[PDB]
Design a protein around this ligand. Structure first.
Ligand SMILES: Nc1nc2c(ncn2[C@@H]2O[C@H](COP(=O)(O)OP(=O)(O)OP(=O)(O)O)[C@@H](O)[C@H]2O)c(=O)[nH]1
Ligand SMILES: Nc1nc2c(ncn2[C@@H]2O[C@H](COP(=O)(O)OP(=O)(O)OP(=O)(O)O)[C@@H](O)[C@H]2O)c(=O)[nH]1
Ligand SMILES: [Mg+2]
Ligand SMILES: [Mg+2]
Lengths: 366, 366
C-alpha cells in the first residue's frame, strides 16, 4: 500500500510562519505536521509516500526531509511541479502510481487527529473510494463552510458551502482513500478535488463518507493551530518522553500546570510556569519567571525572564525580551526580536523584524 | 521661631491616593511629605509647627501625627476649621501665633527641594517678607502658569497667569517667610495667599523674591510625584540606610540599576530588578522577577512574580497579580487588587477595587 500527501500550497493562512518553511514542515508540537502523518502511515504499514511538492521545490522539502533515513520510510519526490491545484498532482503522479490494483491513501498536511486508519480493512464494500470522504462532526460547520450530507447509506448527495438549513454537521476531514481508477477521472491540469472531482463523484454515486469518532482539527490557521495543539497534546503526553506534569525537572525548578511538551535539550528557567498545552522546541532557552500558557516555542528561540506568551506562536530563531506579553493569537516570524516591555496583542510579525513598540490591537508588522 | 504648614486641602490632583489619607500624609519616597518638611525645619531649629488642618480634622492628621513623639518637635494642632482657603488659616491662627516680633515660616505640603532655609539669616534687609515669595527656575512656566517677575531689586512687580511674553521663568516655590504684621492684612474669611494677599503685597512693594539654586518640584500631581521622586532620591541615598545600588542584599539576590529606597522590612524577591529611582515601602513583598522601574510601592503591598510596574504608584494595601504591567502614570488606590496578566496603561483605580480587565488607554476605574 502507498500514500500521497499533498505537500504543496502556499500556506496563506499560516503566512508569517510559511514565509520561511513550507506548511507541511511547520513544527506542530515538537515535530513537523507531515512527520505526524508519516508516523501514522508507517504504523499502518505504508512504506511508499508520494509528496506533491510545489512550494519550495528543492530548497526546503527535499533537503529537510532527511526523516527518510529515520522512520524506516521512503519518499518518492517525483511530483515537482508548477501550482496544479489540489487534484492535479494526482494526475501528474499517475505514472509513478503505476495504476496498480491496490488502492492508495491521500492526505492533507494540515489535519491532525487520532488518525483512525482502519478504513483500509473497513469500507471495502463496493466503493469507488473506500469511505474516501472522511468526515468529522463540528458544531461550527457554518463558518467552516464545507458540509457533507452523509446519510445512513453513506452515499454523498451533494456538497454545500455555507448551508442555511441544517442539512448536516459533518465536514471534510482531509483524509481519503481511492481506488486507482480515479486517476482516469482527474484531468492533467490545474483542478481541485474539493470543487471539481468530488461533486462529480457524489453525482456518480461512487463517493462514500467515513465518520470520525475521535478528535480532529485542521491546523492551517494560527487559531486552529493553538486549539488543535490543545486537543492533541493530551493524546501525545504518554506517547513521548516530553504528578500534574510532563517535564517537571528539566531546568532548575519550575512549575507545570498541565500537559505540555518540553524538548530534552531545552533549558527551562528557574521558577517558570509552563502552562497547560504548551510546546517548547529544541535548544530553546526560557527565562526565570516566564509563563508559557498556551504558546508554542519553536527551535532556537530565547525568552527573557518575566515574559508571558499565551495562545501565541513564536518563530524559529526569535529573541524575545524580558518582560514582554505576547497575548491573543499572535504569530512571530523566523527571526523576530522583541525589546523588553513590549506588548503584542495578537499581532503577526513578518520574519527578520525588530519590535520595539507596544501594539494593543490585532495587526500585522511588516 | 515657628513655622506654619498648610496641611488642609482636598488633594484633588492626587485624588486616588488622597481619598484615604490627606495630601501631607501621602508617603513620598518612604516618609510623608510633611515629615520631610518638618525634618528640614528641625534642621533649621524650628521647634513649633502649626498645622492648618481642614481635610480629615482628627481622623487622620491628629492620630497619624505621632511623629511629634519623635523628631523632638511639637505641633500645635489648633487650626481645625472649615475650608478657609490658602490664606484664611493664617487669620485663624493669628491668636496662637501671638503676633510676636520674631518672623514665622509658611510652607505648603506639596513641595520638595533641598530646602535652603538660610533665607532666615539672609534677606533681612528691610522686607515685609524676607524673600518671602521664594521662586524656582522652570523652563515649562507656561503650563505651570504662575510666573513671578523678579528683577535685580527683587521687588515683585506683578503676578502673571499664562503670560504670552517672556516676562520671566521663575515660578512660586511654595515656601514663604513672613513678618507677623501680615496678620493684620489677612482678613478672617476664605481667601487665597496666591491670588488675594500676594498681589496686594506686590503692589505695596513689600514682596521680595528669593531665588532657589537647587532642585525643586511640586509633587501634588502623580506625574510630578514621579518626576520629583526621580529628582529627590539621589540626594537622599546617602542620607538614609535604604556598587550601583542602595539596598542590594535585602532579600535573596536582586539587581539595582540606580538610586532607590528599599525599606529594611521589605522582602525583595529572588531575581527582581529594582530599577532607578524606585521606592519600596515597609512590610512590602516583591515577587521573584519583578521590575520596579520608576514606581513607588507603598506600605503593605504585595507584587507577584514577573510583574512590571514602571513610573506608577500603588496604594497602601494592594495585592498586585503575578504577570501584570502597570505602566505610564498609573495610580492605584488604598486596597486595589489586580488579577494576573492585567495590563494598566496609565489608569487610576479608586480604593477597594478589583481589576481583572486590560486597560490600554488612560482612564479611571471607579
Ligand atoms: N501539490 C499541491 N498541493 C496543494 C496545492 N494547493 C493546496 N494544496 C494542498 O491542500 C491542502 C490545504 O491547502 P493550502 O494550500 O495549504 O492552504 P492555503 O494556502 O490557504 O490554500 P487553499 O487551501 O488551496 O485555498 C494542503 O494539503 C496543501 O498541500 C497546490 O497547488 N499543489
Ligand atoms: N488649611 C488649608 N490649606 C489649604 C486649603 N486649600 C489648599 N491648602 C494648601 O495649599 C496647598 C496646595 O493646594 P491643595 O488643596 O493641596 O491642591 P488642590 O487640592 O488641587 O487645590 P488648590 O487649593 O486649588 O491648590 C497645600 O499646602 C494645601 O494644604 C484649605 O482649604 N485649607
Ligand atoms: Mg488545511
Ligand atoms: Mg502643590
Amino acid at each position: 500500500m502507498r500514500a500521497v500527501i499533498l505537500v504543496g500550497g502556499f500556506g496563506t493562512r499560516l503566512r508569517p510562519l510559511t514565509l520561511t518553511t513550507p506548511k507541511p514542515l511547520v513544527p506542530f508540537c515538537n515535530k513537523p505536521m507531515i512527520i505526524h502523518q508519516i508516523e501514522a502511515l508507517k504504523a499502518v504499514g505504508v512504506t511508499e509516500v508520494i509528496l506533491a511538492v510545489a512550494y519550495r521545490p528543492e530548497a526546503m522539502k527535499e533537503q529537510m526531509d532527511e526523516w527518510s533515513r529515520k522512520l524506516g520510510v521512503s519518499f518518492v519526490f517525483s511530483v515537482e511541479e508548477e501550482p496544479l491545484g489540489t487534484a492535479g498532482p494526482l494526475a501528474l503522479a499517475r505514472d509513478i502510481l503505476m495504476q496498480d490494483d491496490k488502492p492508495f491513501f491521500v492526505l492533507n498536511s494540515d489535519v491532525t487527529c487520532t488518525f483512525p486508519m482502519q478504513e483500509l480493512l473497513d469500507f471495502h464494500k463496493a466503493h469507488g473510494g473506500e469511505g474516501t470522504i472522511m468526515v468529522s462532526q463540528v458544531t461550527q460547520w457554518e463558518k467552516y463552510g464545507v458540509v457533507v450530507y452523509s446519510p445512513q447509506n453513506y452515499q454523498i448527495e451533494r456538497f454545500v458551502e455555507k448551508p442555511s438549513r441544517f442539512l448536516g454537521d459533518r465536514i471534510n476531514a482531509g483524509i481519503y482513500i481511492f481506488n486507482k481508477s480515479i486517476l482516469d477521472r482527474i484531468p492533467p491540469r490545474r483542478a481541485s478535488i474539493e470543487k471539481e472531482i468530488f461533486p462529480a463523484m457524489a453525482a456518480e454515486g461512487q463517493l462514500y463518507a467515513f465518520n470520525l469518532e475521535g478528535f480532529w482539527m485542521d491546523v492551517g490557521q494560527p487559531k486552529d493551530y493553538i486549539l488543535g495543539m490543545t486537543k492533541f497534546i493530551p493524546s501525545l503526553v504518554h506517547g513521548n518522553r516530553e504528578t500534574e506534569a510532563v517535564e517537571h525537572q528539566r531546568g532548575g525548578r519550575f512549575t507545570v500546570i498541565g500537559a505540555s511538551l518540553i524538548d530534552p535539550s531545552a533549558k527551562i528557567g528557574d521558577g517558570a510556569v509552563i502552562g497547560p498545552y504548551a510546546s517548547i522546541g529544541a535548544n530553546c532557552v526560557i527565562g526565570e519567571s516566564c509563563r508559557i500558557d498556551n504558546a508554542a516555542i519553536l527551535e532556537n528561540s530565547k525568552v527573557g525572564k518575566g515574559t508571558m506568551v499565551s495562545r501565541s506562536i513564536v518563530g524559529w530563531n526569535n529573541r524575545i525580551g524580558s518582560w514582554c506579553h505576547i497575548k491573543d493569537i499572535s504569530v512571530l516570524g523566523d527571526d523576530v526580536e522583541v525589546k523588553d516591555g513590549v506588548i503584542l496583542i495578537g499581532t503577526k510579525v513578518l520574519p527578520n523584524k525588530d519590535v520595539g513598540e507596544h501594539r494593543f490591537e490585532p495587526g500585522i508588522i511588516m
